[PDB]
Write a protein that binds this ligand. Structure first.
Ligand SMILES: CC(C)(C)OC(=O)N[C@H](C(=O)NO)c1ccc(-n2cccn2)cc1
Ligand SMILES: CC(C)(C)OC(=O)N[C@H](C(=O)NO)c1ccc(-n2cccn2)cc1
Ligand SMILES: CC(C)(C)OC(=O)N[C@H](C(=O)NO)c1ccc(-n2cccn2)cc1
Ligand SMILES: [Zn+2]
Ligand SMILES: [Zn+2]
Ligand SMILES: [Zn+2]
Ligand SMILES: [Zn+2]
Ligand SMILES: [Zn+2]
Ligand SMILES: [Zn+2]
Lengths: 513, 518, 511, 95
């Protein structure tokens, strides 16, 4: 743990982290829907749909072991409500025991099989009722058909959206969660995995949402060490002197103008078994992206959001938590992130500057706002030197992603078809949508520099996301490598918060590989 | 049928060249296992060196000439390399003491050439053809290529060799002398012979589309484009029908008609049909975007980078479909019925133009709120897709320069394909592989559908928030295909060759291979 | 001939004032040798002080008045200085016990006043004329000016004095101008030349200042015909049918989107003597430049000013007045202008459109807002068929002039060293500043079109004034030709009015 | 070489002390090339001594007096052959 430099004494010297969350205190019980539902404590919500008849009427099929509630759920009463996706109703009443109970439903549409996005809308409608009720217990009745992964996705999304971050606020939660579903015994094992995936995601969220004055290269690296100590992971934080020795000139150049020294994070998980596959997970770690002398001054550049430019690193650390907690066998994982800050100063690097990477490749900087690939370049070189089987990087690299896949799907690039398929597979089971994008070699010529070995950016080609991958590919000589661009999906613009995107995706990759 | 004019000097037809210098080229293919003759013109060897990058040149083919064989000896050629695209010219006398020209083009160190690689080879070849008055060209293949790549060779060669001078008045070329003979030496030549005439048809289908796109909007308008389509159908002998404004009003195509309201040219719906003499199996509708000029409407293209002077190419989809009409009508495939459709019009600014905010009714009854008059393509396609499905077809495939966002997603080399059917998309992808016109599969993300929810109309034309224009546009179109397999190819980024300053005629070979391999 | 209307309230002619208040001013020139008479009106002395920056005022002229002479004594005036632009008013009684008004205007510390300095002097003098109801102005030149500068004094004075009120809905100009100077006999002939040069400039000014709803292709050509009739120049106005016959596709294309038919103005002055030099003066005549589909919507495009895009035509017509009035010998002059309007319509020509010029050359339009060179192209071809010795065009062609020469100096381009030199001297003697700019041939390749014979505009080169000049040069086959870009100098932005730039320059050129 | 006309044919006036090269530079062979400014062609062949030589031309347009810009385009065309050829010697003949 290094000392965080300050300009004034009022400047924060560490990132506030909540480990023990209210979600961890929620007792979850899963019952089989065939046995009938009990209504007694808290709020009970039925998940109902109407296949074929769009915005159809609500009909409750499950038998409820309560007379008062049963009269409420009769067809005559419920038919006045419709199943439009997201729609919800809930009433307060007394049960057979004169106890105050709340009953309601959430519309699941006319489609039998809910998608990842659809299920998200259901949870938000559900969470809205939770934020307006001081309940002791929530009961969810699944009168819709969902698989093991989607059920777990339900819980994760529920836990994540339910949780509210109040670390910077200052000027309750349910204690029980009951679930009625079919084949309850088979879904039971998904519960505690959901809790872990939940915190891994929320942990990353805490890092991303944390402002750049709290979350800087020093404080973020200190947090990584703390996380490694709580899990029992080998850790190593490389400073400037060590980074200089390793000749990481690309990575060092971006952070030259910062008051915070560069910090290279190296976390390692080794299984207490014969290692088989070795994996390096590399996350982009820019604590703040001002754009450098290529300042983000253009309209739509969203400079106030650029605290999230370390979303990739956050995802990797979140993955580190899940892996360190679940403790997979036959695997050795290295969690890497070259963390720094891209600022404007007399010491900042300039447009046109030519710099040398640790692999000897000289680079002509055409735009200081393309700092991510520069840091990733030296990180990718370091990763391959570890002698790993798979290298997967995750980063908020290109804004063009907003124009390609938008805010829902992340983009994946790579030099190996099999590794890419694993990521796509990991996307399906994690329910974090990802689409395969091509590395078009025909554009490679645009990176031919007149003076340097290679250009940082293209002057003509507008396929910025593809061009960047072409850049990165020049720093992986002989290793299976994939690149996930999460620039468009990292931030939830409507909800005004991070998604912690990539944590569950990477964990599924580590577990299923 | 009659093209309206403002002045008498305004053109009343698109100048079209059917008989090109390429069609006058006698092509002969010989088997290389018999030796090469060198006599007239330039003889070019396509040579590589597998493994050894920038490797030395080695001629393997037997040459039926003592002098030329000695000239082509390894000792002589070793100072030249096979760097992909590299080429040299040789001067020498043959056994008859006659002057002959010989040379080569480097094909690199990789054994299997890609679509881009072969393209670079052909370009080097055409440079040798240019600025040189040759009567005959002979190409010797000392590399291994399959029938498709061989055909791709000819297609690219013919297209790049050809020069469009339809609009040259006093700057025509006085050194424009084309070759009259093409000789080809290859291995297993008997297998490659059938590819020659397939390449020539594919060439013109592509060049035909190129001619329509390159033609300026004052020459190429809704009336002149439909007239050219009628002329093409007559030369092919395909059933054709040109729907005017009155029929379109009857068909209640309010979206399509609204877009063309501000034009001096009446809307023209092109409907060509090819039916094979045999038991029909697959019925196909090919829909091309046909905006002869896109000013953007009242949403005028005035922003920097809007490239308004390029918008003559906004009928590239229509051109691609018609180019396919030529190829299909010429090759005459069996067991297929194809409908070539394009709702052609012009998007102009006028007192009669439709406005941003205007709510219009499509032919399927769906009301649409126009949020941007510059998103007119999907509007015209909407009524066209409805018309297509009413034909009771098996597949509906549209091709259009729909979204500039394609330039930021896939760029200028790969087109994007969307659809509602996994099987149809693979057919397009497979057709892309055999036609060598690159296409990449892009997702229709349903989560974005809500952004098209209009407050007053059934649906919004565009999204206010989402910047994923290509996906959002696809979501719009999907709302106009009720129960048919449908795919959408966005060729906005690949249609125009910015470096060469000319159209690619992209999509003609892709669609033809699709119709043929189906 | 008949101006089309949208509503009955739409104007059908350009309001033109021919007989101006300036023309009613009786101007008399006296020799300073003999003393200056005052008493009547307002009497202003033009005084300087060579050597001293803000030195004291000293009146050198002998004054034929005892009261005034004592008042004007050095001791009294020494509290005043000759700082350029300074002005003062004096009250006193004369030899006749009458109240008289006297004053001065500072002419600086330099012995030889420049054109700008003299202009600043005139503005100071005119300031005295505006807020004061005078019947007579008397100016005493106690400074040295040559005949050309003297004429320029009068021209600038008359021009600035005059106020344009043709468009005012909701007064008393002097009736006499007396001038005391040394060598009066030589300057007298400059007076009426100034009067003519004044109106030629003011005439064009009226046409330019006239809004596009008043000044359109039909009404402008009608005004030219009317001008030709008040003069005696041969005239012919070519309509769309003749332009179609002449195959003027570039010129006709620009006007396709307008409600006003294209009108080609052709005035001719032929001398009653053995003709020597034949000259064609070509002026850009865009009554309004909206930019076409390349709409002037960009910041700094100044669309509200584009009524002045016929400034070149106005200058040519203004030159026609001076020449038709002064009747030069041994010359035949053709006044040409391809007049039209560049609007947005269903009938407008589009970016990318390929059009055919009258000389057979096909042109690819890359920007509809570059319509000027297109109209000039057909005009230059039309000009050369007249078999002339010199072709000179004047046009508000490129905004880039504001970045090159600014608002004071116009730019001249050409294919003939000799013709360029004539223009430069004409610039000196007319006192309308012009600087010689190069036609850089290395940029010519940017006009190489893929499909058409030539490109309308360049995609790369930002030297728009030179690139445009390269375009025009392609439409003059074998004749001495010059091109004056007055985009930057046409409008006086500070004064909120036109300069009528080019009238005196071209007239001096003809003379 | 130039051709005072526009895109005119290439014509070599200089005497070449080599028979093989002289045959190459004959009007009929060179007339197949034009003098468009910047245009160039070079061929490899054996001279009278059976030695490998490369011969060619660079078009200098139709104007007799080349400008600095004209000469610049000529030199660049020349440099392209120098960058694409492993030559020991370059020989330039000013016609
Ligand atoms: C074209 C280029 C290289 C100038 O910009 C980018 O491709 N990406 C910048 C960037 O490199 N930032 O470090 C970028 C990346 C992400 C965003 N972004 C904005 C919202 C979400 N992501 C904006 C710009
Ligand atoms: C709907 C919107 C405003 C997001 O997108 C567009 O308007 N795109 C325009 C258009 O007119 N679509 O019909 C568009 C389409 C293609 C291009 N394009 C530019 C080069 C290649 N394609 C540019 C703009
Ligand atoms: C096409 C280009 C960019 C090379 O030049 C112009 O856009 N010229 C325009 C024009 O409309 N020409 O017909 C133009 C722009 C500004 C001015 N101008 C601006 C202040 C004074 N003049 C005049 C013309
Ligand atoms: Zn950046
Ligand atoms: Zn960044
Ligand atoms: Zn559009
Ligand atoms: Zn369009
Ligand atoms: Zn203009
Ligand atoms: Zn203009």
């Amino acid at each position: 743990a290094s000392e965080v430099p300050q300009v004034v004494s009022l400047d924060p010297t560490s990132i506030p982290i909540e480990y023990n969350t209210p979600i961890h205190d929620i007792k979850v019980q899963v019952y089989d829907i065939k046995g009938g539902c009990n209504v007694e404590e808290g709020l009970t919500i039925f998940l109902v749909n109407n296949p074929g008849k769009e915005n159809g009427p609500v009909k409750i099929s499950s038998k409820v072991n309560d007379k008062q509630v049963s009269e409420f759920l009769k067809d005559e009463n419920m038919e006045k409500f419709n199943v439009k996706l997201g729609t919800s109703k809930h009433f307060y009443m007394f049960n057979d025991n004169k106890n105050s109970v709340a009953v309601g439903y959430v519309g699941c549409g006319s489609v039998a099989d809910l998608s990842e996005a659809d299920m998200k809308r259901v949870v938000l409608s559900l969470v809205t009722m939770l934020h307006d009720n001081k309940l002791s217990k929530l009961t969810v009745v699944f009168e819709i058909n969902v698989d093991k992964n989607l059920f777990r996705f339900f819980l994760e999304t529920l836990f994540y959206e339910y949780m509210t971050d109040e670390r910077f606020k200052s000027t309750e939660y349910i204690k029980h969660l009951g679930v009625y579903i079919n084949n309850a015994d088979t879904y039971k094992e998904e519960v505690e995995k959901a809790r872990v995936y939940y915190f891994g995601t929320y942990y990353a969220s805490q890092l991303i949402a944390a402002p750049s004055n709290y979350c800087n290269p020093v404080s973020l690296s200190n947090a990584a060490v703390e996380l490694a100590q709580k899990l029992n992971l080998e850790y190593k934080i490389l400073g400037v002197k060590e980074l200089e020795e390793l000749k990481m000139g690309a990575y060092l150049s971006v952070g030259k103008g910062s008051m915070y020294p560069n910090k290279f994070i190296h976390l390692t998980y080794k299984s207490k078994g014969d290692v088989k596959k070795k994996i390096a997970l590399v996350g982009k770690g820019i604590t703040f992206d001002s754009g450098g002398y290529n300042l983000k001054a253009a309209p739509g550049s969203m400079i106030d959001l650029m605290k999230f430019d370390m979303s990739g690193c956050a995802a990797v650390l979140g993955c580190a938590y899940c892996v360190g907690t679940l403790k997979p066998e036959n695997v050795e994982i290295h969690f890497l992130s070259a963390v720094c800050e891209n600022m404007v100063s007399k010491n900042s690097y300039r447009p046109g500057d030519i710099i040398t990477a640790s692999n000897g490749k000289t680079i002509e900087v055409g735009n200081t706002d393309a700092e991510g690939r520069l840091t990733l370049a030296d990180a990718l070189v370091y990763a391959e030197k570890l002698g790993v089987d798979y290298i997967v990087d995750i980063a908020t690299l290109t804004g063009a992603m907003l124009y390609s896949l938008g805010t829902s799907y992340a983009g994946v690039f790579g030099n190996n078809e099999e590794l890419i398929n694993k990521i796509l597979q990991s996307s399906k089971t994690s329910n974090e949508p990802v689409w395969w994008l091509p590395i078009i070699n025909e554009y490679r010529a645009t990176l031919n520099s007149k003076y340097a070995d290679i250009n940082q950016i293209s002057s003509s080609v507008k396929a910025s996301s593809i061009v960047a991958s072409l850049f990165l590919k020049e720093f992986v000589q002989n290793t299976a490598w994939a690149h996930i661009d999460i620039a468009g999906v990292s931030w939830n613009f409507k909800a005004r918060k991070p998604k912690g995107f990539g944590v569950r995706l990477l964990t599924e990759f580590v577990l299923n590989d």
